[PDB]
RNA sequence: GGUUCUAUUUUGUUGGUUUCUAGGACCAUCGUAAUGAUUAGGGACGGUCGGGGGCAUCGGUAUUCAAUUGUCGAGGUGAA
């Protein structure tokens, strides 16, 4: 209905979760999809590009409706949902909308990046 | 007994002139003969650099908490 011709996205990519929203060019939403959306959940049977690219497919069925044209996309964290490789999983939602009538505009990171980057040990909640 | 005059020395005091001696303030230059390529200390004037200091403000990103919308499972690990 909206018809709002671009619009951002942030790609979440924790290590079980690849989930694909796809927001206009304001900020209020209108479509997203889970990993467990897409089905699965068994935890250590979550992690690879490969499944993930399904959950950030099927965003565009229902984004359609609304006719969202150039994504623009930030990438938070690398992970996602597997069915073959342990590991990284946040390159297949790009490769998601690349496949389906959606476009890319822009590939971001957007990454809470310190400048050490170890584990966090020393003060309080 | 001593007085008086004259000459000389010494001590104190005063004045003109001649000659000689102490003491106080401030500043220039570094010459050459006795260890041999020496501007050794403090700054004033005029430009200049820096995350040196203390305080009072201000801005941005990320995180967290609280409230509200759209939307249904996540987080961790070598497996758990």
Redesign the pocket.
């Known amino acids: 209905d909206n018809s709002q011709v671009f619009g951002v996205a942030r790609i979440?990519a924790?290590?079980?979760?690849t989930?694909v929203?796809v927001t206009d060019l304001s900020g209020?939403?209108?479509?997203?999809?889970?990993?467990?959306?897409m089905?699965?959940?068994a935890?250590?049977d979550?992690?690879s590009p490969y499944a993930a690219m399904l959950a950030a497919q099927d965003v565009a069925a229902k984004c359609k409706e609304v006719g969202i044209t150039a994504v623009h996309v930030k990438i938070?964290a690398t992970?996602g949902?597997r069915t073959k490789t342990?590991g990284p999983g946040g390159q297949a939602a790009l490769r998601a909308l690349a496949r389906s009538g959606l476009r890319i505009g822009r590939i971001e990171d957007?990454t809470?990046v310190p400048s050490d980057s170890t584990?966090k040990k020393g003060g309080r909640?």
């Not at 209020?28 to 959306?37: D, L, M």
């Open positions: 979440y924790s290590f079980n979760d989930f929203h209020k939403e209108t479509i997203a999809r889970v990993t467990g959306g089905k699965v959940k935890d250590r979550e992690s938070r992970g949902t342990p957007v809470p584990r909640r």
